[PDB]
Symmetry: D2
Subunit: 335 residues, 4 copies
């Protein structure tokens, strides 16, 4: 049956993220549903929230890569039934604004500060109350919870960005960072037919980037590669040093995608951006529609997320390891 | 008759901009044509180059807003003939690469730095040798040399940016700076149907902005105006302070156009740009096709450039005035 | 107060459109609301349903240009309150599908056959039950019901089409038909900044087109006009003769918009369409977001719908006049 | 050495396509070059010209899929050298109009009726005079002349259309016709990552379609496939019946690409195109930039044109087999 209480990690600004053993298990009201978390991923963004002032709100269960099984549905829920395996659409769009009707519910202003695991409660618990079921994607039968969870951000974000940049078979792109996101960016990009060059400061990540399909992998681009030669540069790190590499190597009218959140601000050379018409396109998570596209690509085997799983109570240990860039790929937790 | 020597203003990194009374006038070889300058405009970019280290080559006659009359055509040229009134397409693209064949001849790599008045010789002289006649647009009979001169940049640049921003009747835009480019941007934007709000530190510029069609003008945007409510923000100043205004007032997925070149670098808030998918689009001058459109808009009266003229030998006195923001609109010179 | 029974014109396949005196006044369930019709427009499409046997469904109150005031809201409805003046979004999207969330709720497969007044009940009655209020747009205070009504189709449709064609100040377009939609297409197009040439076989319509802002109006295009010289051709008639005019005068890569529905099938010259890459884009009504864009353009005075009002009971007399192209612009009715 | 006379096939409205053993060998004038034809392909289009009067001009050497080696260069030709292996860009744009500058040199008006082998002389000869060298693309060393010839149209045309339709990894497309163009369209579509369904009346073609990578291949779509379920429908046949299939199976807002020229006219159901906003996009050959993209994709092994070669003098025989749809893929000839 479904318990009266549960354990989970709650984030509070004065105490950080804390394990709580006596959390309530909400019973879904009309239009809501209860999701039993099967897998929740750890995104590097949680590190920015907890340790670097990335402000998303206060006192909420973290964990935004959520995959679970419908455990209970409130009155009026007809689209979902207990037993349905689903993954959460991070942005948690309101569903009624011009954004949520305009194919871009990821930037819904009403939902700003109310994202799953980033403002609103997330997956670092046993039972998640979903107030808006519209923000759910059905997980295909052949896709595991662990992979589905990673798919909601580690894959979704790169997919959304790559789609936005309109990558194609004539694309010659550069990806900076081959971690959780970068690793899936490689596979998504290859699916679009692009040539992919990867940069990463960690040898292990570089080795993995190669196994995943990257056409070229380096720690530092050789002097032999020409500046202003890439059609698109996706920066999954976003510190000034990496942004500078993108601006140097992107071709005229090419695009720079600062997906990474490694700094509060970044500067660009104005004379260069203007005269060569470089485009800096912000990209955030992904849309409800994108998620459906994504789970389909994973299901069909085009994207295989590097995932490793562990018990949810081991989370603090893995956060520490992540802080030290001590592992490759993604790690997901089973509550 | 065509003289064998001329006067003009030559820019050198060591001696700045200097008047030369012994510049050479060369009959055009095959493929080339000699243009007699009728009007050449003074753009603020010239101030950046002469006084602020904006790197635009060395050792060439300045003046990049050029309108004139063909004085001689080399053999092989059959697209133009003596007497034709034409305006120069600044970027001076090679016309044979993938950029030039791809509707973006303004970002041609082969020709990077080979720009009229900003790398290659320009209009601050009596005769300009044009080596690539393809980079000329016919001036309509009812458009004066003075107006056509201003149109090649002051009107062309903002037209190119607005067009790139896909401005429309549903647009709510903010323009910062109502000088040479700004005043014309107001008119172009109104032609596209946008609502225009202008910011300028100088009363005279605000008044002109208003006379030209701006819906609202201010020295300081009222703090009560909702942040993130403009679909596009065109910054024709580009210093850190104005860029910050753009990022604060641009709506989600909206666009920031840093057309101005007032600083070597500009920084943007990373979390804001990413989470709200803000776009920063570099825009440079205009294309050959763009200029034809611009000259048609001007001939039709949709854009009426604010212009006043003087003898080219008065350039020094006007450079100082523009440097002190002493006049409104554009100033053009007649050699 | 709210009456128990009402009058309205119900459409049935056996007996056509007949006036009823015993129509119930539905009490809105949860999530629904009751709209008191203040103004309802007569569209030419209604004639296709009544006389050309255009199958939209059967046994429903017609009238799809709807404007009114909220008379009652069921439980749960909080986005609307009795007294709110709103206009119906014709397509009546379901809201949950990928089309409705994808910025294109006008083609929602789920709501096919359930559009206001064209499958589902409409505005040719006193009180309309609104099952899905997401399909409503608030009417600005300075916009009358009568004008709002015409805005939901007469204006909305050509707006949506014109926007799709990406018209701009460089566009040279041709519109065929200056009636309900045509007259507004003229205004919306001028707003977009395009030069507009209009064709209409009726002098009174040509006279009005000129008054509305058309740059040139004719019955037949003069020989002086070159073929393939229009960037876009909007056909609000759509019979083979008018389509032929479009394909002959549209320029290479240009677009033809068969907005009109005057024929079951139309043919195009394949050789011409392929070699000159002509585009034929289908356009249907408008989206919820389009209507907000539209009502705003009207409130701002950019579009002044030629509207004339009469009492709903006079509908029959007016349908006959429309059948005979006896009047110009739109006629809307006050219940 | 270069002979003073040659043989080739000339088309005339009166005598049809006839072999000539006394054709002159043109000496290149300045800016022009002579090309030694290494391989020329037979496109079904040639049949329409010979037998069905698609009138492209008169008295010209046919054969528009051209690959060869520069035999001679006139004075001033600098970008090309004797011995350079190049493939002709069919449309043979003028290079100086707004279309050629606007990334669409394939619809250049000045060049209408002056295309390689279709108005202007083509490849069914030994030495072709190229009056406009801009319409050449370098053949990579690892691409044979036979394959390159096929790439100038059999691959280029479908590449252009597929690029235009913006196919992607989430695309579910239908291709009708698996001949010369069809077979390559399958390969190009896969490189873009789309799911492909092919239709061909001929068994051998279906069998080849399967070997080329189509996900599903049929003679007739099984009743188990839902109408309006394809994102894009490419018709490489274009007879009323195939178009009808496209209109029935394309999903809302989907696109129909009538690339085939199997009929002088085609009709579309207006009610259906309008309500489901179906798009019909004309597509013609390819652009100079498209060919560079294509030869690169071929060189990279992503597209392997099914090609079989024969002596040019055997052309009369193969034209007959093609009329009889007797062989699969493309057949190219060696002069
Ligand atoms: N824009 C969005 O919507 C969005 C969504 C998810 C994550 N993110 C951001 O993306 C970034 C990465 O997420 P992640 O989970 O993949 O982190 P990760 O820990 O899983 O992987 C990080 C990788 O970056 C590499 N790296 C770090 N600094 C580098 C440098 N200076 N040069 C080269 N390589 C470097 C590391 O070696 C590591 O392999 C984070 O900053 C996160 O906040 C953004
Ligand atoms: N991207 C391009 O291709 C391109 C082409 C031309 C010019 N530009 C750049 O555009 C900028 C303006 O060109 P211009 O000739 O119009 O300058 P201008 O001197 O003709 O007009 C400048 C205007 O900006 C206003 N202004 C200055 N600082 C301001 C501030 N902090 N806040 C608000 N308003 C301010 C001034 O009062 C004045 O009205 C220059 O930096 C120039 O280099 C760029
Ligand atoms: N696609 C859509 O979503 C949509 C929405 C509404 C209406 N429509 C269609 O648009 C068309 C017009 O609607 P309306 O209410 O504005 O019609 P209308 O009666 O209000 O105006 C019709 C005008 O077309 C002119 N006209 C008719 N035949 C002509 C011809 N052969 N040549 C030149 N001019 C001609 C008439 O003189 C008249 O001025 C109808 O066919 C309607 O079904 C389509
Ligand atoms: N628009 C352009 O720019 C362009 C460029 C080249 C060719 N084309 C046109 O494309 C068409 C095909 O060119 P091609 O060289 O590939 O022809 P092809 O002879 O090489 O191959 C034709 C294929 O179509 C199949 N087919 C014919 N009728 C069919 C039907 N009713 N249903 C299903 N399958 C059918 C045949 O079995 C054959 O496999 C021609 O009409 C040609 O004119 C257009
Ligand atoms: Zn994340
Ligand atoms: Zn929302
Ligand atoms: Zn300038
Ligand atoms: Zn170039
Ligand atoms: Zn209607
Ligand atoms: Zn829907
Ligand atoms: Zn062909
Ligand atoms: Zn041309």
């Amino acid at each position: 049956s479904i318990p009266s209480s549960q354990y989970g990690f709650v984030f509070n600004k004065q105490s950080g993220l804390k394990l709580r053993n006596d959390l309530p298990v909400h019973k879904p009201k009309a239009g809501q549903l209860l999701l039993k978390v099967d897998a929740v991923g750890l995104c590097h963004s949680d590190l920015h929230v907890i340790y670097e002032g990335l402000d998303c709100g206060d006192n909420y269960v973290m964990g935004h890569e959520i995959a679970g099984t419908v455990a209970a549905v409130g009155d009026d829920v007809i689209n979902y039934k207990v037993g349905d395996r689903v993954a959460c659409v991070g942005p948690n769009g309101c569903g009624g604004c011009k954004y949520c009707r305009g194919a871009i519910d990821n930037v819904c202003k009403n939902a700003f500060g109310d994202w799953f695991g980033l403002g609103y409660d997330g997956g670092y618990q046993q039972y998640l109350l979903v107030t808006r079921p519209r923000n759910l994607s059905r997980i295909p039968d052949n896709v595991s919870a662990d992979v589905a969870a990673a798919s909601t951000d580690a894959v979704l974000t790169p997919y959304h960005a790559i789609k936005m940049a309109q990558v194609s078979p004539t694309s010659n792109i550069l990806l900076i960072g081959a971690g959780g996101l970068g690793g899936n960016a490689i596979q998504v990009a290859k699916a679009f037919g692009a040539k992919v060059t990867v940069l990463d400061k960690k040898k292990e990540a570089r080795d993995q980037a190669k196994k995943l399909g990257a056409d070229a992998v380096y720690e530092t681009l050789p002097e032999s590669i020409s500046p202003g030669s890439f059609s698109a540069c996706f920066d999954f790190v976003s510190v000034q040093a990496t942004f500078d590499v993108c601006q140097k190597y992107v071709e005229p009218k090419g695009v720079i995608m600062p997906v990474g959140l490694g700094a509060p601000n970044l500067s660009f050379n104005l004379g260069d951006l203007a005269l060569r018409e470089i485009r800096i396109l912000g990209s955030f998570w992904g849309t409800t529609n994108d998620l459906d596209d994504v789970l389909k690509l994973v299901s069909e085997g085009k994207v295989k997320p590097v995932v490793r799983s562990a018990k949810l109570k081991e989370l603090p240990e893995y956060i520490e390891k992540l802080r030290n860039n001590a592992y490759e790929g993604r790690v997901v937790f089973n509550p």
